[PDB]
RNA sequence: CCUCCGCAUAAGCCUGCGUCAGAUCACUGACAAUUAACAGCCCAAUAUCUACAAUCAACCAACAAGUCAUUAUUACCCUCACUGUCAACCCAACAGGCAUGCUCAUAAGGAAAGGUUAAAAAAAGUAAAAGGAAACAUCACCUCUAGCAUCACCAGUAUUAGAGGC
RNA sequence: GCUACCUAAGAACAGAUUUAUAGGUAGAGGCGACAAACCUA
RNA sequence: GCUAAACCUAGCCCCAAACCCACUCCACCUUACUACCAAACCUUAGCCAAACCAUUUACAUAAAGUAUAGGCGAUA
């Protein structure tokens, strides 16, 4: 059917462990540190999208203009494909016109 | 309409069977009348020595001890072979030591190799 | 299949060569298929001397009753229907000899005070000695089964039971465990169940003839 | 998903248990159940 | 209908490796199968 | 003498052939070259005995009397071959020093990949070799997209294995 | 002489001898009835018929007279759990008919338990008059 | 194969009620 | 064997293993806890003690060690009692067959203190790697013949250093012995 | 009682009703097979002859105008290697085809009736009185273009080559 | 590689015949006794 | 009651970093998986959107989506 059969694995999760303990510690970095470095650098994440959060089409546009010459050919053709798709997607057919 | 098998003997027509063969080495030549002449020159020649009186049996007894795996290092073997000749000669032109300019005249040359297995 | 030889012959006919795998691990069994010497009931101090070399602390007369208590535990092993202390109590040669017919049935048997006291008779000897006690106690047994019908064994009145129950002690860290139970050819007949069971004749097929 | 539709047998048993006195194949399955039970209420 | 009346000589002709490698587009075909990673890289 | 094509008739039916261990390589390395030839021939005879016995065992559909003996003789013969190869390699290193025993090279083939081709001993010369000149060992620019694609597949397998290993490690540390 | 390139030979080269020929051999019992004066073998995939004569003359000095070659293709109707065509080991077989009236027959090769032996024969089987009652109890 | 920890508990409660209705205890 | 093929206490290639873990299965793997490569702290036959389970505290001996499942077979305890010879009508025979135990589930025994001792595979002047106890200053070593056959070569024969190093080939030395008088040499061809 | 088939080689497939055991109108695993004179696999240079069909080939009788030959000179010695050989076989519908050599029903090969009953409607066959139907190509011809050569036309020359009409 | 048309080089008995085998003509095409037909359901 | 259900965990996901792949012996461009005689570059095209169709049209942050250009009609 569509249910489980027994009670599932017991969710051993310590909500108070170290790798979550400092979650945002030293993360008011800018005005609480005499303006040396903004929070706009403290994020450890991909350089395609580290803090210019536009739309989906914008997301891909930034991915291209940042790292396109660093992809295998499948990713380049893929990013080009969806970029063409989205450029057609924005201004063609929708609810508000 | 089948392809995944190997290309061994049985594939198609007569001559299509005729050319290829399994893993032999050729022995002769094809001359007139579709007659093959195979020379004793190009044939395999397996001349083993006489086995009588060699005391080394095919298996080795387990009562013997073990040793260390001493690979035949080229510098080590070269030193062990050339040490006495060089020691006497320096106490006394590598042709006396047997250095080979070319192996063009030897039966068993090395580069290319003409020996077998 | 009939035995190992029949399986091997039908294996050769089936072509299934059982490949010999070389393994150092074996079975460290601690039971004996039989006993070293069975004392036939109606000079054996060499076995006692050989046993004292390993244990060095053994009183024969006090060895019986606790073993009888262990034998009583065997009755408890049926009365509690608890194979746990059974496997913790007796030999593996006795576990099939005490359970494979005993299972899938109800037994509420018990022992009571001896008609005749048990006497130690046997002594024996990869080392496992065997000591037997001849006991005539009171028994209260009943064969209840899947139907729940208590079928073989009187209801409440105990009966005199004499037999040469032989336990065995191997030589590691264990102690005496129940080996077997000697019954002489001069033993009295048993009381069977009240059910009548047919012994089928030699079943002739439609082709042959009946003698 | 980041969340799939997990409460089905509870939902269907909430559906069919107010019409379990019918006849025919509609004693069982959710589509027949909804149609007849809706009519009945 | 019995259209597929194949023959081994013509098979290794029209589907072999030498002919499939004679013009560089076929070399590209070989490479396309290779990055596709099949087994029957030719016929 | 065909009598050696079967094993010793005395040991037949004994369910096991009491044979020693294989000759140690360095221990075998102390024997003469003529002795090496003797050892190789004795190994050939025993190995033939092994092959005939095993095939007959299949023909009789029964177990093997000395199953480890065949592979042991094979292993000892392989060790003797290793010693022979070591001596021939010492000869090739001393006398000329070329690395791969056959003369050959690294080049590129019509599939565009980098490989090492082997030259073959053949009579006629490379300025007239009617077959070797047919060997199209040239690649024009039409191999680019496929070559980089091959790089892409290699990288995909690489990142796949790395992710699998490190995530398996993370689950492993979670188990402690 | 398998698994190696033999040396190139010209019109008048030296006799290309061997040192330790790797081409092992296996001669089995005949399967169908055969004449007496020939013994066959499952030679490996490489050597020639005259090579078989030479290898026999080296190993045992047999009087080789006739030599025979037949290429038994391995079968290809047997599948694995992935359901693929997996051809068997194909084999080329050979036969040397030996001379001087010798005729070699196939050798007729290949011509804890006691505890179970004290158990299986010592079953002490259930009596019909017992009727399923357990015999561990003696009463 | 719903990754979740509650609807299981709901179905377990229903099945336990079913077990109680299967044969009521003494 | 197969990728992530589950090994067991039976032989690593057994037919009974193929009736246990056949090649056609892709089963669920077990989580193997990785110990250090020089730190397989069990030796075949050594006395140890099970710190857990029924009959814990006794002394046993680990005989079988399949490092793949990373479990220890300490015979003497930790056994089930199962019938063997399950034939059509044969009564069978009950045997106490013993299963594995985990490396963290048992502790090695101190050879002098007679206690469950966790030891470190440390270094010594005589021995580069050896298990060394912390509760006591003792090193635990690993604990523990051939009649010559008709095809068995003796050690006396095996003591001959007959490989006198020459500058000639093995084929060359043999032909020097064999007397194969060489008339022609090879002709020089190219490398096409 | 059937056999306008059958037996072979050819092609083409790939061990596919051989043997010992399992149980899946009542296939699976292991073991064994096909030992060449037939057929392929070839042919040491440079030049030089090679009009006189075949049809039983002697006549007649032709047109569509012929499907097969060395020789000269130089150089050259050593012999039996390798690979196909099986089979109830191949392409398709879920009616059919298969090139070639022999036997024109035969020496080889094969079985349309699972068992019964004897309905109609249908299908096939037998029997029935009395009557006996109640356009494209093309030969021929015409027209038009083209005065000529080394990859077609053509190795040709306006009685030629190509294109339209009836 | 079926079929359409052609080449090479064979076969059967009476041509505008069929066919064993290789080879050639690729779609913006070829082929076409032109059926506005074919060239892999 | 049977068929059935259900179960984790294989490994995939994206990123971070980092430049990687190519010789057991062998054989492998002829009919690829057989030991052997006398030749390469020459502009991508096209729709779509113009509510049909034609010129036109893509295959770090900030100035700035302003200056340039549009059957001056769509936008880039
Ligand atoms: Mg042959
Ligand atoms: Mg011939
Ligand atoms: Mg045949
Ligand atoms: Mg007949
Ligand atoms: Mg029939
Ligand atoms: Mg009928
Ligand atoms: Mg009429
Ligand atoms: Mg009439
Ligand atoms: Mg064609
Ligand atoms: Mg428009």
Coordinates of N, CA and C in Angstrom, one line a residue, chain B residues 2 6 9 15 33-34 46 48 52 55 72 93 109:
Chain B
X2 N 24.2 -10.4 -36.5 CA 24.8 -10.6 -35.2 C 26.3 -10.2 -35.2
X6 N 33.2 -12.9 -31.2 CA 34.6 -12.5 -31.6 C 34.7 -12.8 -33.1
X9 N 37.4 -18.2 -36.5 CA 37.4 -18.8 -37.8 C 36.1 -18.7 -38.5
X15 N 36.6 -18.3 -49.1 CA 37.8 -17.5 -49.0 C 37.8 -16.6 -47.8
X33 N 51.0 -23.6 -58.3 CA 50.1 -24.7 -58.1 C 49.3 -24.7 -56.8
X34 N 49.3 -23.5 -56.2 CA 48.7 -23.3 -54.8 C 49.4 -24.3 -53.9
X46 N 62.4 -26.6 -31.1 CA 62.4 -26.7 -29.7 C 63.4 -27.9 -29.3
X48 N 65.3 -29.2 -26.3 CA 65.5 -29.2 -24.9 C 66.7 -30.1 -24.6
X52 N 68.6 -36.2 -17.6 CA 69.1 -37.2 -16.8 C 70.2 -36.7 -15.8
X55 N 69.7 -33.1 -10.2 CA 69.2 -33.5 -8.9 C 68.1 -32.5 -8.5
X72 N 66.8 -8.8 -9.2 CA 68.0 -8.6 -9.9 C 68.2 -7.2 -10.3
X93 N 89.2 2.1 -22.5 CA 89.2 0.8 -23.3 C 88.5 -0.3 -22.5
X109 N 71.1 -11.0 -29.7 CA 71.1 -9.5 -29.4 C 70.0 -9.1 -28.5

